Paper text:
To learn more about how circular permutation affects folding pathways, we analyzed a protein domain with a relatively complex folding pathway, namely the second Postsynaptic density protein-95/Discs large/Zonula Occludens-1 ([name]) domain from synapse associated protein 97 ([name]). [name] is a member of the membrane-associated guanylate kinase family, and involved in establishing cell polarity and synaptic potentiation. [name] domains are usually part of such multi domain proteins and have important roles in molecular recognition. [name] domains consist of six β-strands and two α- helices ordered in the following way: β1- β2- β3- α1- β4- β5- α2- β6.
A circularly permuted (cp) [name] PDZ2 domain was generated by fusing the N- and C termini of a pseudo wild-type (pwt) [name] PDZ2 with a glycine and serine linker (GSG) between E315 and P405. The new N- and C- termini, K327 and P326, respectively, were selected since they correspond to the terminals of the naturally occurring circular permutant of a [name] domain from a green alga. The cpSAP97 PDZ2 protein crystallized in the space group C2 with two molecules in the asymmetric unit. The structure was solved by molecular replacement and refined to a resolution of 2.3 Å. The cpSAP97 PDZ2 protein structure has the typical [name] domain fold with six β-strands (β1 to β6) and two α-helices (α1 and α2). The weak electron density and high B-factors for the Gly-Ser-Gly linker and the neighbouring residues in both molecules suggest that this loop is highly flexible. Interestingly, even after moving β1 from the N-terminus to the C-terminus, the orientations of the side-chains in the Ile317-Ile323 region of the cpSAP97 PDZ2 structure are similar to those in the pwtSAP97 PDZ2 structure. The data show that the circular permutation has decreased the stability of the protein from 4.7±0.03 to 2.4±0.09 kcal/mol. To sum up, our results show how a circular permutation neither alters the structure nor significantly affects the function of the protein, [name] PDZ2. We further demonstrate that the canonical protein and the circular permutant fold via a similar mechanism, and that the rate of formation of the low energy intermediate has decreased in the circular permutant.
Residue numbers in the entry:
A (entry chain B): 13 to 104
B (entry chain A): 12 to 105
The structure:
Amino acid sequence: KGLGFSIAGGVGNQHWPGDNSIYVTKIIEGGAAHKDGKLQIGDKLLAVNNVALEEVTHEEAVTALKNTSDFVYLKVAKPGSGEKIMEIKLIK
Amino acid sequence: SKGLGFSIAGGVGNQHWPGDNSIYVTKIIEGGAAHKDGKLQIGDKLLAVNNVALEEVTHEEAVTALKNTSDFVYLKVAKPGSGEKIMEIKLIKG
C-alpha cells in the first residue's frame, strides 16, 4: 500500500470471535483511499477486483490487494448495513 | 463485468502449464461477441487488451484489463499453425 490502508482479519486470524472477514483497520492520511473518502475504518472487504475475499487468509487478502493494476475495484460492506454492497474505485 | 463472451486462464503465479506464464483463452460462450465474430479460438494465447500488454502478468491483472473495457475492444492474439503469428481481433461488447 500503495492504496494507503491496512487490514486485519482472515481465516485463522479472526478479528471478531467466529468471524473470518477482512476488515479495514487503518487509513493513511492523504493516501489514495483517504483522499477518495469513501473507505472507512471498520468496513468489511468483500472483494478486490475480481477476487472474492470471503473465507480467505490474511495473506491471500494482501496478495489480492497487490495484484491489481493501478486501477482498483473494491467491494465493501459498512458495519451494520443491509446487506448492502458498495463499490469504491481507486487509483494507486 | 463481462460482455465479450469468453474466459481466460494462465498468468504469473497461476501457470496453465509448468513454466508458462501466458494468458490463454479457455472458454467461449456460444452466442457471445467473441463467438459471433468467429476469429477467437479456445487455446489461443492472448497477448494484449487495448493498451495493456499481458506478457508476464498475474491473472488478476489480465482479468482487470478485460474488466476496464468499453464499447469497442482491441485484442492481440497469437495463433499457432501456419499463418501470420499475431492476429488482431476487434470486438463489440454485448
